Amino acid sequence: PHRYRPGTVALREIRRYQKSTELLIRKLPFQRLVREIAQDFKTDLRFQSSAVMALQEACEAYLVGLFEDTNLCAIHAKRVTIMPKDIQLARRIRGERA
Amino acid sequence: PHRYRPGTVALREIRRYQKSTELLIRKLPFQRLVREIAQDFKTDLRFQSSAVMALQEACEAYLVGLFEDTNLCAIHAKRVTIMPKDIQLARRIRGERA
Amino acid sequence: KARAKAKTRSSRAGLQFPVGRVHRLLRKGNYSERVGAGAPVYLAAVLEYLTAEILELAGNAARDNKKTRIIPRHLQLAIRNDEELNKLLGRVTIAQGGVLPNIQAVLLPKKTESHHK
Amino acid sequence: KARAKAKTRSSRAGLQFPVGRVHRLLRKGNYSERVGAGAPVYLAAVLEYLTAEIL
Amino acid sequence: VLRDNIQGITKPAIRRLARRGGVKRISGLIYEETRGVLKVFLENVIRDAVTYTEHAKRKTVTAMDVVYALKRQGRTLYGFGG
Amino acid sequence: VLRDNIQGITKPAIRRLARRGGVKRISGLIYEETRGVLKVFLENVIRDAVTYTEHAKRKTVTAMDVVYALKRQGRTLYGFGG
Amino acid sequence: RKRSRKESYSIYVYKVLKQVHPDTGISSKAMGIMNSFVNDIFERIAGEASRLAHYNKRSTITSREIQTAVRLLLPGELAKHAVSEGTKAVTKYTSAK
Amino acid sequence: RSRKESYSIYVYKVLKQVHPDTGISSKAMGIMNSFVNDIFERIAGEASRLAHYNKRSTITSREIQTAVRLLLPGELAKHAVSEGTKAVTKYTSAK
């Protein structure tokens, strides 16, 4: 069987998703997560669908930016593999203490 | 002659300056730098002395914070020596693009 | 009384943006007790210029993509490809904007790529 | 007319921060067209609490 | 059976996002960390959104509530009005 | 002879600051980078300060001008009034 | 005869200081820092309350807006205790007419 | 029936001024509207703060200009300022 080397398909996927703008997270589990969390603050709340879409947009843009910083930290550390400590560093430097 | 190992005095200096709050930059060269730069925007400008002190406070707090982030990046990179690339990374992550 | 015929302030200013509405928006919003006549004019002009700049760059990106309709993608591309707008909108999220095709040079495959020719 | 003795809002609230000054500061600054009576009281109370915690 | 629903932000979706982030290689432990990071981020936003919601005496969360919550966190979003 | 005066932010002062920053070991090339970083930072602040100055039709830079310049850069300073 | 008049929160901070720790002073610089702090949080709260009011087409800023602004700006238990104190104060004011 | 204002028509006129042969999506128009709203609020708020700082009760074109110089970088600010100036002078001329 024909076999591609590790990385080629990853790179193709990078190019594909970086060329496009469609949302990569599933709508329904995101709605369910949001509803669960909001439920923990106030009961029987509702949400507009576009509010959920907005939240998804914000979440995904935030996550790619964090992964970008993570990637730079990894490269800085002479690695190509991202680790929790890289994320923790990036978030610490932005002041996203949590 | 008696001789201390590398790092002991550095650590003592760290403890000393981290215990105190006095300004570490000389007043006069700072005034001269400020006056030169401001001169490049508008001529024959004056400055209140407390304005210069304020600028110095801001500058030094900014610099220690950048060096702190730099230090974390170095440690992250398994180093104890700070490098330009560490500063560049920290500033890039804060968005201090310049 | 004569009651001279109406003329809007934008037209008097040679502008397209609504000076009057900007004035109304300034009045409503607790910005100052009073607002001078030139301020909304100046601001409207600024908004007009910036709009023209963005639309221009976005249309350039559209032609680059052989597209006749401006989409958010082009606006995001325009913003991120312009140093000054990028600074202005560095902490702004453009919905459905995506990201720039920016790949770090070190992650791409080697010059040992297998096709010299 | 009687013109009773001059009490103040901070004293009535049992507070130390100046209700009157906060009200004036709220009025001046283009924050809202009108300002309710409790808002400066509430804010002053918050500021006093935070100061106490810090001090 | 469901698993507190946070698991619906699946590994491949995170992988796709990281790819858009330009990530070529990813440790297996990253995913849970990302989920935790998301929850914190989300909590704060939604918390503020509901606060705005509560102020308006409304039982329906609007897009504007999200927009304001995002703005106050320095994460301005364009495209949904306002 | 003087050297554009940026050199008055000497190596030992930077060393002291880094020590307060907790730095134990420092490359020799750091110092010029720090100076450059400072100039950029300073330029922006002073630029805005002068803008405020110019607005007031004043020829003397006040502390308040600095404070406002710092605030708009998200670098709020306490202790100098306002 | 000329003279001006510069207001500050100094005396109230000192009174509170004397209330919590009777045997302790404060420098003028530190007091200035506390005054700067007070001014900053005041401006933050009024601005946020103003924005909420505008969003809700409301011309009045109430204790609800202060509370909400606090809830947005202040964290957890700090917010809860401040809120409780504010509520206590309004309740004491409203009765003491 | 209610009434929702937007800048749509002005953006569309400008688009035809700069590129007659080109359209724009509604979502993109909304993005442009959001942009406009954001810069409007930023400028007015900064102008407000300056006026407050200068114990001035009036917002003039001076405050707008200054705010612009603070907020916008280099050539963008210079061109915007020049345009605003030209516009005010044209307004003041054609009474």
Q: Decide if E53 contacts E61 (C-beta within 8 A).
A: yes
Q: Decide if A34 contacts A45 (C-beta within 8 A).
A: no
Nearest CA in chain F to G6: F81
For testing contact with chain E, the best of H11, H25, H34 (most E CBs within 10 A): H34
For testing contact with chain G, the best of C25, C30, C32 (most G CBs within 10 A): C30
State the burial class of residue H57 (Cβ atoms within 10 Å of its Cβ: 0-12, 13-18, 19+).
exposed
Asked whether residue C32 is domain-assigned, the answer is yes
Distances in whole angstroms, Cα of residue A78 to Cα of each of A71, A72, B72: 11, 10, 16
Of the candidates E53, G52, E74, E45, which has an alpha carbon nearest to the alpha carbon of residue A48?
E53
Work out the minimum CA distance from C28 to partner chain D, whole angstroms: 10
* CB within 8 Å of H6: residues ≥ 6 apart: H29, H33
In the numeric block, which tokens belong to residue C4? 């001279």
Cα B81 to chain center, whole Å? 16
* CB within 8 Å of A60: residues ≥ 6 apart: A23, A24, A25, E17
**CA distance linking residue H76 with residue C28, whole number of Å:** 28
Q: CB neighbours (10 Å) of residue C63? A: 13
**CA distance linking residue C55 with residue H14, whole number of Å:** 8
Into which CATH architecture does domain H1-95 fall? Answer: Orthogonal Bundle (1.10)
Work out the minimum CA distance from C104 to partner chain A, whole angstroms: 9
Q: CB neighbours (10 Å) of residue D32? A: 22
Chain B residue numbers touching F30 (CB-CB < 8 A): 82-84, 87
Residue with tokens 């900007």: C22
Question: Do chains E and H have 3 or more beta-carbon pairs under 8 angstroms?
Answer: yes
Q: CB neighbours (10 Å) of residue E74? A: 9
For testing contact with chain D, the best of G19, G43, G44, G61 (most D CBs within 10 A): G61
Q: CB neighbours (10 Å) of residue A49? A: 10
Asked whether residue C60 is domain-assigned, the answer is yes
Tell me whether residues A77 and B78 touch, CB distance under 8 A: yes
Of the candidates E11, C74, B34, B63, which has an alpha carbon nearest to the alpha carbon of residue A21?
C74
Chain G residue numbers touching F80 (CB-CB < 8 A): 32, 36
Please list, residue by residue across H3-22, b when 16 or more beta carbons sit within 10 angstroms of its beta carbon and e when fewer do.
Answer: eeeebeebbbebbeebbeeb
∠ CA H7-H12-H15, rounded to 5°: 125
∠ CA G36-H43-A60, rounded to 5°: 90
Instruction: Indicate which CATH number applies to the domain containing A33.
Output: 1.10.20.10
Work out the minimum CA distance from G3 to partner chain D, whole angstroms: 21
* H or E segment and range at residue H9: helix H8-18
In the numeric block, which tokens belong to residue E47? 């918390």
Rounded to 10 deg, the angle between the C72-81 and C38-64 helix axes is: 100
- For β-strands B46-47 and F60-61, DSSP reports them as parallel
Q: Decide if G94 contacts D10 (C-beta within 8 A).
A: no
Of the candidates B53, G92, H27, D31, which has an alpha carbon nearest to the alpha carbon of residue F77?
B53
Asked whether residue C116 is domain-assigned, the answer is no
Which of C91, C98, C103 is opposite residue E76, by nearest beta carbon?
C91
DSSP string, A20-88: -----S-HHHHHHHHHHHHHHHSTT-EE-HHHHHHHHHHHHHHHHHHHHHHHHHHHHTT-SEE-HHHHH
Residue with tokens 């950048």: B66
Cα C56 to chain center, whole Å? 9
Domain locations along chain G: 3-97
Asked whether residue C93 is domain-assigned, the answer is yes
This structure's resolution (Å) is 4.8
**CA distance linking residue G52 with residue G71, whole number of Å:** 12
Cα H73 to chain center, whole Å? 15
Chain C residue numbers touching E75 (CB-CB < 8 A): 91, 93
Instruction: Indicate which CATH number applies to the domain containing C61.
Output: 1.10.20.10
Q: What is the CATH number assigned to the segment(s) E3-82?
A: 1.10.20.10
Q: Decide if C23 contacts C36 (C-beta within 8 A).
A: no
Tell me whether residues C99 and A18 touch, CB distance under 8 A: yes
Largest CA distance in chain A: 56
Which of B77, B86, B93 is opposite residue A69, by nearest beta carbon?
B93
Beta strand residue intervals within C1-117, DSSP E: 34-35, 69-70, 92-94
Helix (H, G, I), strand (E, B) or coil at C94: strand
Q: Decide if G64 contacts E55 (C-beta within 8 A).
A: yes
**CA distance linking residue C6 with residue C93, whole number of Å:** 42
One-letter amino acid for residue B8 of the chain? T
**CA distance linking residue C55 with residue C78, whole number of Å:** 9
In the numeric block, which tokens belong to residue H17? 């001024």
Chain A residue numbers touching B76 (CB-CB < 8 A): 73, 76-77, 85-86, 89
Q: Decide if F79 contacts G32 (C-beta within 8 A).
A: yes
Q: Decide if H16 contacts C56 (C-beta within 8 A).
A: no
Nearest CA in chain G to E69: G72
Domain assignment of residue C67, given as a range: 8-110
> Considering its fold, how many domains does chain B have in total?
1
Work out the minimum CA distance from G69 to partner chain E, whole angstroms: 9
> Considering its fold, how many domains does chain C have in total?
1
Q: Decide if F48 contacts H77 (C-beta within 8 A).
A: no
* H or E segment and range at residue C116: none
**CA distance linking residue E82 with residue F9, whole number of Å:** 47
May I ask the CATH class of domain G3-97? mainly alpha
Torsion region of H77: left, alpha or beta (phi above 0 gives left; psi -120 to 50 gives alpha):
alpha
φ/ψ of residue A42, rounded to 5: -140, 140
State the burial class of residue B85 (Cβ atoms within 10 Å of its Cβ: 0-12, 13-18, 19+).
middle
For chain F, how far is it from start to end, CA to CA, in angstroms?
41
Q: Decide if E61 contacts E50 (C-beta within 8 A).
A: yes
**CA distance linking residue E76 with residue F56, whole number of Å:** 32
For testing contact with chain B, the best of F9, F14, F15, F24 (most B CBs within 10 A): F24
Distances in whole angstroms, Cα of residue B3 to Cα of each of B8, E22, F23: 11, 51, 22
DSSP string, G21-81: -SS----HHHHHHHHHHHHHHHHHHHHHHHHHHHHTT--EE-HHHHHHHHHHHS-HHHHHH
In the numeric block, which tokens belong to residue F1? 């002879």
Alpha-carbon Rg for chain D, nearest whole angstrom, is: 13
φ/ψ of residue E58, rounded to 5: -115, 150
Residue with tokens 């401001």: B38
Cα A43 to chain center, whole Å? 28
Residue with tokens 């589990």: A29
Distances in whole angstroms, Cα of residue C4 to Cα of each of C11, C15, G25, H92: 16, 21, 72, 19
DSSP string, B11-73: HHHHHHHHH-----S-HHHHHHHHHHHHHHHSTT-EE-HHHHHHHHHHHHHHHHHHHHHHHHH
One-letter amino acid for residue C63 of the chain? R
Q: Where are the alpha helices (DSSP H) in F1-82?
A: 11-20, 30-56, 63-72
Domain assignment of residue B30, given as a range: 1-98
